[PDB]
């Protein structure tokens, strides 16, 4: 045919609605981007097979692209919410990415994203009190 992931990357490597560009790096807001980095490896909306992990109320919601439904966005994403154990989410996410050959190159990134989201959901420590120095301290 005329269209492919390669064609889409050709069209969209220089500009996206998801593309945010600053001096220290180029990022992507795409939900199917496991590292929020602009690259063909991580361009989820570009690649035919892609993964995306988003926070849930308690756990992680993992979306994956269905290759037989690219023409149907409302039914194009296999969504599973993993709200059990941290170790069990990692097991399931790493299987969804590496057992049957759907993005084993993104296995590590997916597991890391799940871990980061769970750590974010973990309760947060109070701040240490601020200590003044020198002129401000004596003031």
């Amino acid at each position: 045919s005329n269209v492919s992931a390669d064609l889409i990357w050709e069209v969209s490597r220089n500009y996206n609605s998801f593309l945010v560009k600053q001096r220290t790096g180029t990022f992507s807001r795409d939900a199917l981007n496991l590292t929020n980095q602009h690259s063909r490896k991580h361009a989820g909306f570009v690649n035919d097979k892609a993964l995306g992990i988003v926070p849930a109320e308690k756990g992680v919601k993992v979306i994956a692209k269905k290759v037989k439904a690219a023409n149907k966005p409302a039914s194009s994403l296999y969504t599973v919410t993993y709200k059990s154990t941290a170790r069990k989410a990692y097991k399931a996410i790493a299987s969804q990415a590496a057992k049957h050959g759907y993005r084993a190159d993104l296995r590590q990134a997916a597991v890391a994203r799940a871990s980061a989201i769970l750590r974010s959901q973990r309760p947060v420590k109070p701040e240490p009190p601020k200590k003044l120095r020198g002129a401000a301290a004596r003031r």
């Binding site: 045919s1 005329n2 269209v3 492919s4 992931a5 390669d6 064609l7």
Partner: peptide, 11 residues
Amino acid sequence: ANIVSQADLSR
């Protein structure tokens, strides 16, 4: 007519 027939360079 396109200058290429298959746009999937991976295949």
